[model samples]
Target chain A: SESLSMGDLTLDPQKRLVTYKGEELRLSPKEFDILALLIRQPGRVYSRQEIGQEIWQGRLPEGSNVVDVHMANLRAKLRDLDGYGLLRTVRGVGYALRG
Target chain B: ESLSMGDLTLDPQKRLVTYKGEELRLSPKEFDILALLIRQPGRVYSRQEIGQEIWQGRLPEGSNVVDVHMANLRAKLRDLDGYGLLRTVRGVGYALRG
Candidate 1:
């Protein structure tokens, strides 16, 4: 019964559900975690280091692009699901909600 | 108050800085040099240390021209405001103030 709703988006913790505008959006466990992290704090910057910590239980190799891969997936999924752009890329820094 | 002053706007990851809404548009070297030092406020950087950080310890195949270029950058930026932004420490190095 763990679910959080935000602006026409619904996240089901158990099923790892992500629905946008009343449509199911398929996502892997890793991708769901990343999206959850992003949605948790809108308009805040999440450094790659921080994201790595949340996903890998507090440690990840330096300069790993695993974060980028999952981030790319999350962006594509959200875009494909509703043709809306909420994710933004911050160069040389990290990801943040577009503002 | 000693280490910090007026907000010297800088985008570290973007490697860009805007002084009074005027983009300095520093070269890659200047950007690297400025970023390395400003990342740590009030830190004095000798040429050796700058070469290590900016040049990645591999000095380009030429004479040490880092200071000359930095001086040029300083002059250009100063033309925008004054020496109140980037201050030199004589024999020491340079530091970014507000």
Candidate 2:
């Protein structure tokens, strides 16, 4: 019952599961976490540095495209679900959900 | 029974909007404009009125934001609905009709 709902996607943090348009998505733990953050606030952008600190245990690997790579993968899987642009990049800022 | 006029539907509680049965991606301003118009069909609202309602009367002089947003809203509705749902009254204002 305590789920983050936005647009047609729902994230049940307790279950560590995500569903788009009623179909469950099998996402990696990191992917689910990243999406959890975005889904909690659909339109708010989160900077890479912030994400690194949270997801990378405060030590971002130098020149690591880890975040971007994971984000790309996450976006691909979600896009496959509904073709909606759920993730948006902010150029010099960061990224946010495009709902 | 959503706030529907023409081919546009506004889901107020969910902040969802659609045209021709397809979801529409609208900026906050565009959503506000469409919401206002859809609430009262066939009622022409001047640009000044729209600006006042959407921007709290702080629309700067010479700024074409209202016109640009209306144009974009109109284009999106037309693209999805395949017909003009928003009407521009010459020398007057705009209205929504099916």
The most accurate candidate by TM-score is 2
Task: Compute each candidate's TM-score over C-alphas.
Answer: 0.44, 0.46
Per-residue lDDT tens digits of candidate 1, residues B14-91? 666666667767888886776665654543455545665577556653555666756866776787674545554433
* Model 2 ranges with Cα > 4 A deviation: A93-99, B1-98
B1-98 per-residue lDDT for model 2 (tens digits): 47766666788777789876798888888888888777656444556557657887677767887788888887777677536567664321111111
Interface residue Cα RMSD of candidate 2 after superposition: 18.6
Q: Against the hidden true structure, what lDDT does model 2 obtain? A: 0.67
Least well predicted 10-residue stretch by lDDT in candidate 1 chain A:
A90-99
User: Is model 2 an incorrect, acceptable, medium or high docking prediction?
Assistant: incorrect
Whole-structure CA lDDT of model 1: 0.58
lDDT of 2 by residue, A1-99 (tens): 899888778889998988888888878788888888667545544555446645676576668777778888877887788745777765321111111
Model 1, residue B70: distance off in Å is 25
